[PDB]
Design an enzyme around this catalytic site. Structure first.
Site, PDB file in Angstrom:
ATOM      1  N   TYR A  65      -7.172   2.883   5.118  1.00 29.75           N
ATOM      2  CA  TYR A  65      -7.744   2.457   6.400  1.00 29.75           C
ATOM      3  C   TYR A  65      -9.203   2.013   6.346  1.00 29.75           C
ATOM      4  CZ  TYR A  65      -3.266   3.540   8.448  1.00 29.75           C
ATOM      5  OH  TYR A  65      -1.917   3.524   8.759  1.00 29.75           O
ATOM      6  N   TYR A 108      -5.220   3.029  15.601  1.00 32.39           N
ATOM      7  CA  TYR A 108      -4.445   2.072  16.378  1.00 32.39           C
ATOM      8  C   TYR A 108      -4.452   2.321  17.882  1.00 32.39           C
ATOM      9  CZ  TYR A 108      -2.425   0.207  12.023  1.00 32.39           C
ATOM     10  OH  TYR A 108      -2.220  -0.389  10.795  1.00 32.39           O
ATOM     11  N   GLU A 162      -2.583  -1.533   6.176  1.00 32.27           N
ATOM     12  CA  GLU A 162      -1.195  -1.160   6.398  1.00 32.27           C
ATOM     13  C   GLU A 162      -0.251  -1.797   5.376  1.00 32.27           C
ATOM     14  OE1 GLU A 162       1.018   1.533   7.984  1.00 32.27           O
ATOM     15  OE2 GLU A 162      -0.886   1.142   9.000  1.00 32.27           O
ATOM     16  N   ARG A 165      -0.823   0.191   2.078  1.00 27.34           N
ATOM     17  CA  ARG A 165      -0.303   1.516   2.341  1.00 27.34           C
ATOM     18  C   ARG A 165       1.227   1.520   2.251  1.00 27.34           C
ATOM     19  NH1 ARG A 165      -2.021   6.295   4.487  1.00 27.34           N
ATOM     20  NH2 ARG A 165      -0.414   7.253   5.826  1.00 27.34           N
TER      21      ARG A 165
END
EC number: 3.2.2.22
Length: 173
Positions: A65, A108, A162, A165
């Site tokens: 992140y 988010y 993301e 990840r």
């Protein structure tokens, strides 16, 4: 910290895929970052577009992140969730002139809320990333409104953090 370069200018599926693989290769996905030195706790991702504008995202190697970013002479950081992270991020962009920490976090739920009025149907792709880079850069000179900034963070996080990840987790089955 290791610097990972990506440009939207003449971007292909292959250049983008190689970019994400590179990021994934630096991750050490652990539920929490602790037993990790601050000298290798972050990955720096320099993004540039067709306008030749460039921003550098700071990614936490523990979760991929975005913890903050740099645009020229300014650095912006999401509200750290704790004291460890609060002082960890002080090692980021140390040579930058202007430093700012938002009162809100980069999760988010917060970002969606902050984009509110605006961003429905957030489209992803090279075009959106290109525009997101400009939004990030111009924030530092008053050209970018908060909701636009939030939407732009979401684009970067979904296309980068993301993506890396997800590939890490499929990578370990």
């Amino acid at each position: 910290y290791p610097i990972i370069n990506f440009t939207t200018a003449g971007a292909t599926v292959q250049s983008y895929t190689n970019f994400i693989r590179a990021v994934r290769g630096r991750l050490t996905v652990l539920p929490n970052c602790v037993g990790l030195p601050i000298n290798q706790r972050f990955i720096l991702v320099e993004l540039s577009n067709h306008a030749e504008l460039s921003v550098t995202l700071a990614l936490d190697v523990c979760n991929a992140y975005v913890v903050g970013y740099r645009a020229g002479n300014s650095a912006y950081f999401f509200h750290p969730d704790n004291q460890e992270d609060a002082e960890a991020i002080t090692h980021l962009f140390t040579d930058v002139q202007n430093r700012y920490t938002f009162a809100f976090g980069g999760n988010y739920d917060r970002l969606e809320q902050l984009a509110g009025n605006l961003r429905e149907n957030i489209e992803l792709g090279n075009g959106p990333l290109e525009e997101a880079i400009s939004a990030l850069y111009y924030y530092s000179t008053g050209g970018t409104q908060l909701p636009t900034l939030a939407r732009s963070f979401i684009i970067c996080i979904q296309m980068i953090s993301e993506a890396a990840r997800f590939q890490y987790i499929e990578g370990e089955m």
